[PDB]
Amino acid sequence: SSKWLDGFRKWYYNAAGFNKLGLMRDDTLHETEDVKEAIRRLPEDLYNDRMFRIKRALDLTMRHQILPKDQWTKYEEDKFYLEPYLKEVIRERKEREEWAKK
Amino acid sequence: PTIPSRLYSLLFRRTSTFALTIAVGALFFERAFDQGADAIYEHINEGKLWKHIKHKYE
Amino acid sequence: MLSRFLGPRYRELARNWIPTAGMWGTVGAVGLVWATDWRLILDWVPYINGKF
Amino acid sequence: TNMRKTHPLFKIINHSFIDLPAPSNISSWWNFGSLLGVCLMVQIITGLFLAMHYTSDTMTAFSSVTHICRDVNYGWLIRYMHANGASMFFICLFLHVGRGLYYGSYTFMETWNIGVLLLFAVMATAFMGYVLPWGQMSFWGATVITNLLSAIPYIGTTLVEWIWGGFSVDKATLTRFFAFHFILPFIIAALAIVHLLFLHETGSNNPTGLNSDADKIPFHPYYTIKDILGILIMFLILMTLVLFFPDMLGDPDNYMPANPLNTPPHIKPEWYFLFAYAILRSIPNKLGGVLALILSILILALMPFLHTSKQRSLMFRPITQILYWILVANLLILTWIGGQPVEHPFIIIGQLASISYFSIILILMPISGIIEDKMLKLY
Amino acid sequence: VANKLCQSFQTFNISYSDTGLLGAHFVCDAMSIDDMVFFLQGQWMRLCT
Amino acid sequence: GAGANTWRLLTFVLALPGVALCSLNCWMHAGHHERPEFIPYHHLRIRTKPFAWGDGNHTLFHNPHVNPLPTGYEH
Amino acid sequence: GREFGNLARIRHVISYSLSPFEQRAFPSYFSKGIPNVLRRTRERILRVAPPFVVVYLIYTWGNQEFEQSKRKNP
Amino acid sequence: SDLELHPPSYPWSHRGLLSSLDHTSIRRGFQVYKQVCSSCHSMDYVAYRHLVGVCYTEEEAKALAEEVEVQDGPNDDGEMFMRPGKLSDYFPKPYPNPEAARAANNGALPPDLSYIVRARHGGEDYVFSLLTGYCEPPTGVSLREGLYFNPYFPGQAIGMAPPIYTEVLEYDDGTPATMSQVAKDVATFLRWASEPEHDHRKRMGLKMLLMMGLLLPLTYAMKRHKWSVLKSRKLAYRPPK
Numbered sequence A: 001s002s003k004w005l006d007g008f009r010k011w012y013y014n015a016a017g018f019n020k021l022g023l024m025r026d027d028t029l030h031e032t033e034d035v036k037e038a039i040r041r042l043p044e045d046l047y048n049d050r051m052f053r054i055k056r057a058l059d060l061t062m063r064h065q066i067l068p069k070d071q072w073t074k075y076e077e078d079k080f081y082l083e084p085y086l087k088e089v090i091r092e093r094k095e096r097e098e099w100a101k102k
Numbered sequence B: 001p002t003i004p005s006r007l008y009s010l011l012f013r014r015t016s017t018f019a020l021t022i023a024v025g026a027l028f029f030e031r032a033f034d035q036g037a038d039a040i041y042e043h044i045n046e047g048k049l050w051k052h053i054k055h056k057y058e
Numbered sequence C: 001m002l003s004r005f006l007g008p009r010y011r012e013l014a015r016n017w018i019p020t021a022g023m024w025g026t027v028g029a030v031g032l033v034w035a036t037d038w039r040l041i042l043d044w045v046p047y048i049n050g051k052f
Numbered sequence D: 001t002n003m004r005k006t007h008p009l010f011k012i013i014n015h016s017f018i019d020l021p022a023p024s025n026i027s028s029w030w031n032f033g034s035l036l037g038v039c040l041m042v043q044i045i046t047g048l049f050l051a052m053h054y055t056s057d058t059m060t061a062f063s064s065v066t067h068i069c070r071d072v073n074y075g076w077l078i079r080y081m082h083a084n085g086a087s088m089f090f091i092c093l094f095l096h097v098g099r100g101l102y103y104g105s106y107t108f109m110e111t112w113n114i115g116v117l118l119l120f121a122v123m124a125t126a127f128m129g130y131v132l133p134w135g136q137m138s139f140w141g142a143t144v145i146t147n148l149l150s151a152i153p154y155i156g157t158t159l160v161e162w163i164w165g166g167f168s169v170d171k172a173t174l175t176r177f178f179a180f181h182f183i184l185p186f187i188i189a190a191l192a193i194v195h196l197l198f199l200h201e202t203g204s205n206n207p208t209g210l211n212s213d214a215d216k217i218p219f220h221p222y223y224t225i226k227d228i229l230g231i232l233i234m235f236l237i238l239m240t241l242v243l244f245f246p247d248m249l250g251d252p253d254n255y256m257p258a259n260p261l262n263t264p265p266h267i268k269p270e271w272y273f274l275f276a277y278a279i280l281r282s283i284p285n286k287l288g289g290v291l292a293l294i295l296s297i298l299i300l301a302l303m304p305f306l307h308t309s310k311q312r313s314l315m316f317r318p319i320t321q322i323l324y325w326i327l328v329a330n331l332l333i334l335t336w337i338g339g340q341p342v343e344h345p346f347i348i349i350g351q352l353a354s355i356s357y358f359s360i361i362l363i364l365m366p367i368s369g370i371i372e373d374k375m376l377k378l379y
Numbered sequence E: 001v002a003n004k005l006c007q008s009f010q011t012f013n014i015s016y017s018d019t020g021l022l023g024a025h026f027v028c029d030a031m032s033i034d035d036m037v038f039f040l041q042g043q044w045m046r047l048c049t
Numbered sequence F: 001g002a003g004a005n006t007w008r009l010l011t012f013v014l015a016l017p018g019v020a021l022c023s024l025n026c027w028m029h030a031g032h033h034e035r036p037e038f039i040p041y042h043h044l045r046i047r048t049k050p051f052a053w054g055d056g057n058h059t060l061f062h063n064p065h066v067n068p069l070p071t072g073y074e075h
Numbered sequence G: 001g002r003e004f005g006n007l008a009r010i011r012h013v014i015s016y017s018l019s020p021f022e023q024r025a026f027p028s029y030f031s032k033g034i035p036n037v038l039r040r041t042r043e044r045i046l047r048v049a050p051p052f053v054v055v056y057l058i059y060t061w062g063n064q065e066f067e068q069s070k071r072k073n074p
Numbered sequence H: 001s002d003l004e005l006h007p008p009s010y011p012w013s014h015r016g017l018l019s020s021l022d023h024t025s026i027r028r029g030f031q032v033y034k035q036v037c038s039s040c041h042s043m044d045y046v047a048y049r050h051l052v053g054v055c056y057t058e059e060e061a062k063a064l065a066e067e068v069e070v071q072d073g074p075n076d077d078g079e080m081f082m083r084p085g086k087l088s089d090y091f092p093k094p095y096p097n098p099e100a101a102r103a104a105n106n107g108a109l110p111p112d113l114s115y116i117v118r119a120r121h122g123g124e125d126y127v128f129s130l131l132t133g134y135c136e137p138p139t140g141v142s143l144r145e146g147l148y149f150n151p152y153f154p155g156q157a158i159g160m161a162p163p164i165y166t167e168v169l170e171y172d173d174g175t176p177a178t179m180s181q182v183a184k185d186v187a188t189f190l191r192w193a194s195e196p197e198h199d200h201r202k203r204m205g206l207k208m209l210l211m212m213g214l215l216l217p218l219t220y221a222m223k224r225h226k227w228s229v230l231k232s233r234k235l236a237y238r239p240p241k
């Protein structure tokens, strides 16, 4: 966990390949009701940054190109911008479901 | 007055003239392409087809 | 009941659209004689008279 | 004013093909879908010109097909493009389903289910069409696969007597197979209309799997000329497959007349069924083999409920990419094994191939999805 | 006016030393835009034909 | 017309398709008949000096199937 | 519904385009196409190829074992 | 014997993709079939008019069909009657029914040869290897009398006596009728009989190849034009900060 799991996480981040399209991790998440609500709750700056990064990725995958290596999203600089919003939406959905159980 | 300007102007600029160009080119291409492919096919099969040996049996 | 188009403007439109409709008719006639391999006109043309 | 948006017939064509928003980054694989539709039309058109001379009678079916090839003007051309167009139809169909599996297109569940209904219909249509020329392989393949369809106790024997219209395969079976083979492509065409209708409520998928609403382009003129180019490439492949190797994919044993007392040393279906055939004989029980064939073709229907990743496409999932390509490799091995006789070492290879096929689709891909989810620090 | 497309449109001819810009400019809402482009181009083609 | 583009068009339309057409046409014409009967006229196949390369009786681009020798053909 | 005009919401994005009539349809075809083909196949070859390699191995071994099994035992 | 010898690949004149059949060989093979193979084998799906324009002229095939009796009928009095043949008649059956063919050929049924190179793995290679592969049986195996050993027949027990040797017939064009020459000619004729459309198919394929090689870069160029409006596109972002 100390030595190579972080190293294997870095190698897997390089190998998965959304960093060379300029995407962050949370841009790659497939939408559900939860993800759409979490995106709807985002502020305007992060929403506009996300949508520009997504359409830049679609432009790059149109031409079958990738970003230059200095413009690849770094593993440490990758911010998890969405997942507190997603965790709050998941928590309130679980609260609604457990109320509907009883 | 140059040749590509006048070739665009009196042949490609109008759509009806474009279609007339396509139809006449289609007819002449049919004739020339049929001749060329028939000549290639009879050269590859020299002496093998029936028309090469048709004269022997009148 | 086609009396709405009796004026100088529709005559002007008509004499504007004589050459385009005539050229489209020429395209249709040439395409018809090309596709049908009609023997009336294709015997009057020099190069296409090779298979006859 | 304009007829493209206000005329009720041109409004449908404009909404489906002209001003339809499509993703700007879809690869050539999406062209396969339109190719399938083109193949359908080609098959239907060529099928109609086989029907103007075909005689559905056991005395005069083989003779009528030979008369089509030898005496009808360009009849050999129409017959062999019908056969190789069935083969090209199945090639395009297989790549269409592979595109659906790889890029997560099964989350459109209604479109996926109308798809697997279409797949069932075209498999039955190709089966009865292959019975139609009434050669040795047509008669014996029909007898073998319908007799193993009869394996259900207390129900299957009455169903096989009802399907045959008699004690075995005879003239009634040939005529009703002709009627069914003619009429099934029109249900296929209507189901393709419903397929497209269920697609167009949500739009196409893209290779990245992301929301392409940030960047979409009209279908005209981009994907119009892209599908035209795909049609031209497909017609290159099909006309090479007709004009140069007209019976490379075919089977020579279909060129003898159907002798009911001449059992061939090998009995096979066509190649596009063969993998299911190798899943059929991988189990030494007839109920088990037929039901395993049903699960091997309905696991596509079970597929949308076996999705575990928080992502959609396999573009950012390398382990599940490896498992997918192992699955495609296993499918190729199953096709080769179903081509092969039931001897050593083909029986154990076929058993391990079917076991690995069901294990990869059912078990290993959700495990790989949850492993990659844990690996990406989100679970 | 009849289709309620525009908020405004305006044609222009702009001239500099042996060059210029000749065309149109319109402001409208989103849902109208495509239709007006078609209509505008049709008008030009009518003047061409 | 003060332009290279007409010469570009004239190369890509008249010149290169013309040379391709005559290349294919010469491939249609690439059939040679059998060799003539060896009749030894004294006004050709002459040797006023032995040749300066190799055998002294073979020419520079000699081919043994169409080009004769003053002794005759060779097999 | 799903027409152009209300697909999404994009702000602050500028796009630049040319005419197709004044740019080349094959701009540096080989000199920029060959390195991207090598880059794409370098990215995907280790995911795609070894299953088909072991397909060829199983195919050859099965053919050899079948021809051995048809061969008798001296 | 369960293991079976495979026929090799012979360098046929029509082996290539654009190489047609040799029609002189088709003519000689038809002469071989008429003189030898028509005694036991049928070609019900091939008529005398099919030979016109391929290997025989109109009057030649007319005479060759007129030298054949065809059972026409029914007559106005209500009976069958023999007549001289014509160009619309097919090749005559050697036997009226398969069971008489079985009775005259020691139980074995001689197959109809209209599709026999399309119905065997190997085709004309298989037919040549079957006709030229007759040999004495090896030791250990002792086959039944009236059967013959052929390593290319599946099961190695053929009911057909070897019909081919040197000077089994004559050739009108002056060709040495050896064993291999007659077998090659009849294999060429059998390939023509299975596929009468073979040369026309190869010509249409050559036209297809040339037309597709013309059409594919042009349609690709149209795609690259109408998509090069999009593939050179640049996107920018203007965040207000």
Ligand SMILES: CCCCCCCCCCCCCCCCCC(=O)OC[C@H](COP(=O)(O)OCCN)OC(=O)CCCCCCCCCCCCCCCCC
Pocket: A015, D318, D319, D322, D326, D329, D330, D333, D349, D352, D353, D356, G042, G043, G044, G045, G046, G047, G050, G051, G054, G055, G058
């Ligand atoms: C830690 C790995 C390091 C690899 C380093 C390679 C060199 C790196 C430096 C040069 C760059 C080369 C190109 C880089 C390509 C992309 C990155 C890469 O190398 O990825 C490795 C690739 C995918 O990585 P990952 O998914 O993590 O691997 C898990 C292994 N299963 O994984 C692989 O390539 C491994 C794939 C193994 C597949 C084995 C399949 C065996 C089973 C097949 C059965 C088929 C059916 C048989 C019949 C069944 C019935 C009998």
Ligand code: HEC
Pocket: H032, H033, H036, H037, H038, H039, H040, H041, H105, H108, H109, H110, H111, H116, H127, H130, H153, H154, H157, H158, H159, H160, H161, H163, H164, H186
């Ligand atoms: C009467 C003696 C025959 C002559 C003359 C020819 N054939 Fe024949 N043929 C005959 C029989 C009884 C059989 C069946 C053999 C058996 O054991 O069942 C055959 C078979 C063939 C076959 C099919 C072989 C196969 O593997 O299916 C072929 C291709 C064949 N014969 C060719 C052939 C040719 C070309 C002939 C003319 C030279 C010919 N045969 C003459 C009976 C007789």
Ligand code: HEM
Pocket: D029, D030, D031, D032, D033, D034, D036, D037, D040, D093, D096, D097, D100, D103, D105, D106, D108, D111, D112, D114, D115, D116, D118, D119, D122, D188, D192, D195, D196, D199, D203, D204, D205, D206, D300
């Ligand atoms: C009868 C043969 C079939 C025809 C004619 C057909 C037709 C089409 C067409 C025209 C499209 C839209 C174009 C495209 O996106 O490729 C499409 C898409 C699709 N089809 Fe089919 N299809 C067939 C078989 C199937 C099958 C068997 C499945 C299920 C496995 C299927 C599932 C889909 C899916 C999921 C899409 C959506 C594409 C995406 O957004 O990724 N189709 N089909």
Ligand code: HEM
Pocket: D040, D043, D044, D045, D046, D047, D048, D050, D051, D054, D065, D079, D082, D083, D086, D089, D122, D123, D125, D126, D129, D130, D131, D132, D133, D181, D182, D183, D185, D186
């Ligand atoms: C309504 C449309 C169709 C009609 C009228 C039709 C009609 C026919 C007819 C009459 C035959 C027998 C003639 C022959 O075998 O050459 C035939 C054969 C066949 N058809 Fe169809 N067909 C149609 C659609 C299809 C489709 C969509 C498929 C593909 C799934 C298909 C696959 C086949 C196959 C595989 C054969 C056997 C070819 C062979 O002889 O080897 N047909 N069809």
